[PDB]
Structure formats: structure tokens, C-alpha cells
Amino acid sequence: DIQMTQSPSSVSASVGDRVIITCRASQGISSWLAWYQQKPGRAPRLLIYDASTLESGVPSRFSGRGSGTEFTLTINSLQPEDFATYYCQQGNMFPLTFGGGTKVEIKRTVAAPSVFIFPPSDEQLKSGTASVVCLLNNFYPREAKVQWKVDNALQSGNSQESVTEQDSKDSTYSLSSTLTLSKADYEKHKVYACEVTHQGLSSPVTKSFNRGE
Amino acid sequence: VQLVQSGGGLVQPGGSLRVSCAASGFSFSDHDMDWVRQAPGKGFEWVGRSRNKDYSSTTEYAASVRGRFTISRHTSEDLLYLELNTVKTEDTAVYFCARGPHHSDRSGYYGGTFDIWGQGTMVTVSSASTKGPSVFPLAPSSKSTSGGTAALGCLVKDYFPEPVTVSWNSGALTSGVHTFPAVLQSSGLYSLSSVVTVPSSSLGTQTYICNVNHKPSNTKVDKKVEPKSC
């Protein structure tokens, strides 16, 4: 019933930079606005209430201003720990209504990932299934490529990748990729390799191992 | 002031489920308590409010969930309930309990803001069945050793529904741990990995237990990841 327009949807800044986010209301809500910060996987946190009032415990760099139908939330010196999705909430009338949210990410110095390979444990092998895991650790930016090769035969259909949110300390990323074979298809082949492409590597890197070792 | 949530998990479409929240550190009676839901990869939507003992109609709901959801309180135990009757596919989300304004708060009659939220509870609407996970050590080796570090982890496989919680050494190892999001496999079961990179010199002295919790199936496994012998 009261629409909330939040902009931007997504923002990237460096450490120390000023980030601004605005919120638009369909009708005037006076000062009945709150701002929350949702770090991924956690619960939301109250940041600002009464449009401009800073809640105890929050760093003095956060600051909300505005009234009526136009509000803002500045973050003056962006810190790596300030990565989250930010939401405005309207408290003037029922239904309580939120903004669409704004995602805040860092921009950092390009970092190349560490590549680690994990063969199947004999535990998973007695059950009849084989899973080889490749891990990419602490890289930036987020784009990366992982190619599985079994006996130098590239693979599709038997693999699934997963990526993390940015770190709240070093603003980097991590990625696991899992290759799932059967104990039969696995024991047929010899060399299992993982070819990682990133822009922090002038050359693709390939971690291999031989089955049974 | 705290809020702890519980319940949830899987629920057949058209079924029922009760989600709860426990509050401590405050006079539960004197506060309004709302329910908010977040669809996966989406924003928050308000589900409803339970009023603070000065009301005779003690509840307000959003029109979208108004005919299927009932919000209630325990007679005396400081609990908040959210019973999702005749659930639909669009009701799969994380349900958060939050605390609203105090009965002396002038704004609270028509609306209000929150200050404390719960951790959330995942409500998955599906007609699959619960499966406990399998926990496999990803042992540290020369393949997982870089310079001055080794990476070891856990592979939690073939479980449903979501979520799964992974911790290392009862929560005391929080440096370098990377818990990955879960991927929905072809079978309809999820898999997630938990890795932690540690110093190589501690691998023969330090003990590494990953803790895996799957509350929907009531499965907990505390796995010893160990350097292979070879």
C-alpha cells in the first residue's frame, strides 16, 4: 500500500569511499523510517531509526537524513566489514513495507586464487560414489573459470560450482567445484585435473593427481 | 535482549507448519512482535504482528498471507508462534521474528520499526522427504598444501531440506574458514563444502573437528579430518 523505491540496487566502492543510498516513499511517512544491515547468512541489524537517529552500538560513520517521502543513508568511510544488503523500512501505516534493498561491495586490488584439489576419501568410496573437490581461495574479482579434465577429457554434466560472499576482512572470494562420478566411472580413469582461469594469473593453473595416490 | 527461533523445515504443499521464537531480556508482554519473511534471493515482506496485551484484537496480517497464516502467543512462556496453514509454493522463505514498539510507543498503533531480529527459520515447501547428510573429510595433503598453509574441510552430501550449519572446533576456529553455499544436485539433494586453511606446522599437533548440524533430520556429526598417512 505504501511503495518504497530504493536505489541503487547494487554498489561497488573502495575502502574509505562515501556511499549514498536513497529511499522514496509513495506517501509521506514523516520520520517513520528505519535502516537495517543484513550481512549474508546472519540476521538483520538495526542501523538507524526515526529517519536520522543512530542506534547505540553503530559506528558514527553511518548517517540517515531526510523526511516525508525522501530519505538517505550515507556511509562515509567504507570498511570491508560494511559489506551487506541495506534496507529501508516504513513504519507509518500497515502493511509494514520495505525497500528492495541495496547490495554494497568492495573494490580491491586484484588477487589470484590458491588452487587446492581434494581426492575422494575412502569413506565416500566404500559407499560407491566418488567426489573430487577443487577449491579456489581468496581471489578478486569474482569472475573465475574452473575446467575439470579426466584423462585430458574435458567434462560437463557431472560438476557443480559454488561461490561465497565477499569476506568481511580481506574482501576476497572463494569457490568450490565438485565433480561427482560413480565408483565405476571413477575407477576407470587415471588422472584427475582441475584447470583454473583467473585474471590474476597470466597462465591458467592446473592441479592434478592420480587415482589411488 | 534476544530472540531465538525454531521449528520450520520441510512441509508438503497444502500442509501446515508452526514456527516459533523465544524472547529473553525483556518484558515480552509490553511489546509488539512482528513476523517478516524473505524469499530466496528477494527482499523482505512483512507477514504480520502480534499485539502487546493492550489490544482485544491482538493481531494484524498482510493481505497476501491473511487467509492462510495465524499468529499467536504462548499463554505464559514468552513464546511467539506463526502457524502456516495450507502452505503454498510461494511461502518458501526464511521467516524472521522481530520485536516492535513498546506499549508506550505512540507510533505503534499504526506501524512502527524493529530493533532486534531473530536468526531466521527456513520454511521449504516441497513434497520430497527429509534426508540426513553424509559427512566426508577432505583431508589435507601436498595437493592441499600451498606455502605455509594446508587446506582441509568437510563435504556434507545428499541432504534435504535446507539448511545445514557447519562450525569448526565448537566455534573456536573462525579464522580462515569458508563455508560454501549449498548446490541443489540432480537428485534433488543438496551438497555443501566447508574448508578451513590452517598453518602446516600444526597438522600433526592440532586436532580438527568440523561440526555439522541438520536440524530438519536431527542429525549432528562431529568429524575428525586428519592428514592422510601417505
Numbering used by the authors:
A (entry chain B): 1 to 213
B (entry chain A): 2 to 52, 52A, 52B, 52C, 53 to 82, 82A, 82B, 82C, ...
From the reporting publication:
The HCMV Pentamer, composed of gH, gL, UL128, UL130, and UL131A, enhances entry into epithelial, endothelial, and myeloid cells by interacting with the cell surface receptor neuropilin 2 (NRP2). The other critical tropism-determining complex is the HCMV Pentamer, which is composed of glycoproteins UL128, UL130, and UL131A and the same gH and gL proteins that comprise the bulk of the HCMV Trimer. This elongated heteropentamer mediates tropism for endothelial and epithelial cells by binding to neuropilin 2 (NRP2) and triggering the viral fusion protein, gB, to facilitate entry into host cells. HCMV-directed antibodies isolated from asymptomatic donors predominantly target the Pentamer, suggesting that Pentamer-specific antibodies may restrict viral dissemination, making Pentamer a target for the development of vaccines and immunotherapeutics.
Model building was facilitated by high-resolution crystal structures of unbound Fabs (1-103: 1.9 Å, 1-32: 2.1 Å, 2-18: 2.8 Å, and 2-25: 2.5 Å), which were then used as reference restraints and lightly refined as a part of the complex. The epitopes of Fabs 2-18 and 2-25 overlap substantially with each other, with both Fabs binding to the junction between ULs 128 and 131A. This junction where UL128 meets UL131A does not fit into one of the preexisting antigenic sites, but rather overlaps with both sites 2 and 5 of IR1 (16, 38), thus representing a previously undescribed neutralizing epitope. All four of these antibodies effectively neutralized HCMV when incubated with virions in a standard neutralization assay, with 2-18 exhibiting the most potent neutralization. No such decrease in potency was observed for 2-18 Fab. The similarity in epitopes between these two mAbs implies that the decrease in 2-25 Fab potency can be attributed to the lower affinity of 2-25 compared to 2-18, suggesting that 2-25 requires the avidity effects of bivalency to neutralize effectively. As expected based on the results of our NRP2 competition assay, the two most potently neutralizing mAbs that we examined, 2-18 and 2-25, do not appear to compete with NRP2 a1a2b1b2 based on our structural analysis. These mAbs both bind to the junction between ULs 128 and 131A, and although this epitope is directly adjacent to the NRP2-binding interface, the binding angles of 2-18 and 2-25 result in these two Fabs being directed away from the β sheet–rich face of the Pentamer that is responsible for engaging NRP2. Because the dimerization interface is formed by two copies of UL128, it is likely that the binding of 2-18 and 2-25 would prevent dimerization from taking place while still allowing NRP2 engagement to occur.
